[PDB]
Symmetry: D2
Subunit: 233 residues, 4 copies
Amino acid sequence: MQNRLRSALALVTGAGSGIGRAVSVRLAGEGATVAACDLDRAAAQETVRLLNHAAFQADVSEARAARCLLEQVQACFSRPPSVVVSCAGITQDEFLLHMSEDDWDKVIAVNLKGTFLVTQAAAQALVSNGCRGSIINISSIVGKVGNVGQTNYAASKAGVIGLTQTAARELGRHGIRCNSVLPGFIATPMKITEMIPMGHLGDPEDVADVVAFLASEDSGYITGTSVEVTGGL
Amino acid sequence: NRLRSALALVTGAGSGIGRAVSVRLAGEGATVAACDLDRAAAQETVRLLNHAAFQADVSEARAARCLLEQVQACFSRPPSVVVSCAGITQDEFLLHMSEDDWDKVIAVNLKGTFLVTQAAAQALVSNGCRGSIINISSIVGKVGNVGQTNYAASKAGVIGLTQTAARELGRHGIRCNSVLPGFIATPMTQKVPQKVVDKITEMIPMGHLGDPEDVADVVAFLASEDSGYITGTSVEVTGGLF
Amino acid sequence: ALALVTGAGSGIGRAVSVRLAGEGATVAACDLDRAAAQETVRLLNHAAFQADVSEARAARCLLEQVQACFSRPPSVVVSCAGITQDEFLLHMSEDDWDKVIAVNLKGTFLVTQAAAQALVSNGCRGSIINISSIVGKVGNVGQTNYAASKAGVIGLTQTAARELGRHGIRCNSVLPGFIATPMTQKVPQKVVDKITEMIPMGHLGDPEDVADVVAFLASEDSGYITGTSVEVTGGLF
Amino acid sequence: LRSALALVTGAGSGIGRAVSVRLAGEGATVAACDLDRAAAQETVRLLGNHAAFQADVSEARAARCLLEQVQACFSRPPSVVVSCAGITQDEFLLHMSEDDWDKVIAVNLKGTFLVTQAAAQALVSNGCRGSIINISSIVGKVGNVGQTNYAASKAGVIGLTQTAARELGRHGIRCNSVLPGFIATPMTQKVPQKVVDKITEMIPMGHLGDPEDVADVVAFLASEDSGYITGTSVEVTGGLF
Ligand SMILES: NC(=O)c1ccc[n+]([C@@H]2O[C@H](COP(=O)([O-])OP(=O)(O)OC[C@H]3O[C@@H](n4cnc5c(N)ncnc54)[C@H](O)[C@@H]3O)[C@@H](O)[C@H]2O)c1
Ligand SMILES: NC(=O)c1ccc[n+]([C@@H]2O[C@H](COP(=O)([O-])OP(=O)(O)OC[C@H]3O[C@@H](n4cnc5c(N)ncnc54)[C@H](O)[C@@H]3O)[C@@H](O)[C@H]2O)c1
Ligand SMILES: NC(=O)c1ccc[n+]([C@@H]2O[C@H](COP(=O)([O-])OP(=O)(O)OC[C@H]3O[C@@H](n4cnc5c(N)ncnc54)[C@H](O)[C@@H]3O)[C@@H](O)[C@H]2O)c1
Ligand SMILES: NC(=O)c1ccc[n+]([C@@H]2O[C@H](COP(=O)([O-])OP(=O)(O)OC[C@H]3O[C@@H](n4cnc5c(N)ncnc54)[C@H](O)[C@@H]3O)[C@@H](O)[C@H]2O)c1
């Protein structure tokens, strides 16, 4: 750990568990004030207790909720977040031959639309206030290579990568960087290790270390790319 | 006649690439079920090619299934070639993009391609039949493009969907592949102004925009047994663009 | 159509010569092994050529001899010549590295250049098709040299397409997965059983499967495809 | 990186010099290696007993001797190895000499292989963990007119690095590639103004990169913050499209 974010306000979605929680703890450790957002307000509050910081409830798949989140953060802190990390994400695995419409729609709405709506609301708040920023979207190596039983998740995560590339291209002129992180097999609540050259499963803190780099000025000429954190999977 | 045996279903068949695919597949001996949101345009395509026209909104779950049922009732077999060319753009900068402009593009381009891939695979597996599913993505799905966050997202999603589908369906003898066209003159792109359309042409090694026939030719290859060991991949038809 | 195929004496190169000659092409079959080439020719006026593609003079002379024999340049050129010399990075001899680079990468460069030079000076259009490997995209344990040489071919081919489109010449790479040929006879059956479980199509490729894709890329059906890679792997994951 | 010994090739100029400065600033001791002895030495002056080494990395004997000299000097193999030695000899494919091709392949691709190998052998024979960082280029992914040789070599470096990472993970050694875009250095000094202002229009961030931008990524890849990253490429291009 280092201290590269002493002036940062960081908004983290899916901050209530796993990678989101590890990200919140790491960014706070670097000096950032964290706006911890989760669908489950008590999970967001618990994260805040582990890190002034504040908890927010939001369903990021909802357009109204994504906008109101950003307005609430702005109200509370008197400024927009300069670091935004979209970690809210879900799976609902099924084989393509049997995937229900709810299986598909839910995953797309949370993982893809949600990331869209947060990127957008974040960028609007930064641009309207004349501020520089770093937006980091957690995708998955599955978005690059696919995975049996996960046609919905693979599509959503590929979509996040495509979204982030385009956002980077549009927002670079405004001083706003946009990057994707592609984790492999991470031990979280969401034979394999023979397939991992590093020889073990990843920890959520392994992803948070990369997110901290991308949130910091040490990546200030990095935008529109994806960084794989998979142990060489 | 590569495709003499075959029945082919083409969505978005009323226009541009879908129409050229229909013509091309019929030229190789296939019977074509030509589907479009516009029944009239589908009927027109069928006239250029017993082939039959079908009407459907592929973004709607019950319509995608009904389309496949309708074709099976008409021809007494499932289609063994299915080409998803139903697609739209609704361009806007990220900072200004409305929820409906996001939603509509994702519904038609991504959800529609999902639902058609699914219904097709289901019809084939249930009938013990081999097949080839070909989804038209875009090179913007690989690299993004300014003003098209929604489109870029949708087309990247089509590539991940197609890769995963390929992997689940190979054991059933069904191939799934994506075609990534570059800049193709169609009614989709006919509204794009010439001062930009000119500048794009300088970034094309082949020195000109593509024809729907160029995309059709790749689709016919992926439909045929000449591509029988190709699955889960994307073929770029861009003239070397970029 | 006049087609030059390097590595034509065996496996993929042989199958490509057969396929293209079946489509009406006249084939110049070239191989390090002169008897291998002649036998390819006898299996298919087609003619056999001997050359070590890794050698600059040999590559230029090959394209000289083809043009003196047919009175025109080849308008389809397929670089199938290539070797493996596998070893772990920790133990890889300089020789193991240099040979694979010389044959697979420099050889493909030399032939791509010599072919392009002949086409452009003659005012002829063409399609150059370079056989890389899926390993050039994802790498493979024991094959640091091969993976580098094959990734190299992909970079060379992308750049070559960018430079040559304006002269009516297309340049593409084919990336096969596991294809049953003499190059893969050494692979243990116990390893092949494993690999096969990871091919969604459920079987190894035949050289004919690669030849089918080369014929498409040789033909004008692929006339707006340049600077790209086509994977022929059965979905190998 | 207080503990660490870093070997940087191409350390006499540009990105290699920036990386040396950056690693030193984080507490590493730097073995600064260059074809030009004088340039390596000035880097050392510009910089915990840092030392200058001369080697032509494209020669197998010079790459093994380099690592032996480093180990003899420091009693330890370098645990961070950054291959920045690299050249261009640009020409159109139709006019490109055998020498222009050969030199670029030898330095950029064979040199990176030999140094990666020598570093890995030294680390493994001593039971030590490390991080090998190879500077490739965004042109290795997408190609570039007039640089058939450079593009082949940088694509080769990516393929080399992926494979190395898969073989060496089991020994505690990471291998990653850095893909810089358009960086202001003596390599790109001869690119004319008009091409540069046009290029700048292709960069979402709206300016050229600095050798320190690249050095910052290298320090990340050298540190334990990147402990679960191996066999991948990090792009530092400002969004260059
Ligand atoms: N864990 C892995 O192996 C892995 C691998 C690759 C990618 N990822 C991705 O990383 C991100 C974090 O995953 P994780 O492993 O920490 O999962 P997790 O379940 O531990 O955390 C996800 C958090 O997202 C929150 N969330 C879900 N829907 C939400 C919504 N609509 N609005 C707000 N919050 C919502 C949940 O309450 C939960 O707190 C996700 O994008 C996930 O897909 C995880
Ligand atoms: N034209 C290009 O430059 C280009 C480039 C890359 C990718 N593509 C893709 O190629 C495919 C075909 O595009 P095109 O150029 O033929 O456009 P087009 O407008 O000429 O053809 C699209 C057809 O899709 C039909 N359609 C629209 N919504 C539908 C729905 N919900 N259900 C069923 N049919 C529907 C339309 O009625 C139309 O007939 C699309 O997926 C497009 O995104 C086009
Ligand atoms: N077989 C596979 O599984 C596989 C997979 C991916 C890629 N490839 C590639 O396909 C191409 C052909 O492979 P194959 O499987 O047909 O192998 P093969 O060994 O059957 O054929 C190779 C031919 O290359 C010729 N050759 C070797 N060096 C030469 C040189 N310097 N000059 C001229 N000719 C030379 C040999 O004499 C031989 O006839 C190679 O580039 C190979 O790397 C093969
Ligand atoms: N500058 C850019 O825009 C850019 C872009 C992409 C990639 N790169 C890569 O970054 C690395 C550093 O480039 P740079 O811009 O700092 O170049 P530079 O010319 O400033 O420095 C390269 C250094 O390598 C040394 N060198 C050359 N050949 C050598 C050899 N055989 N053995 C040992 N040392 C040798 C040179 O003398 C020089 O000191 C190179 O691999 C380059 O290709 C640079």
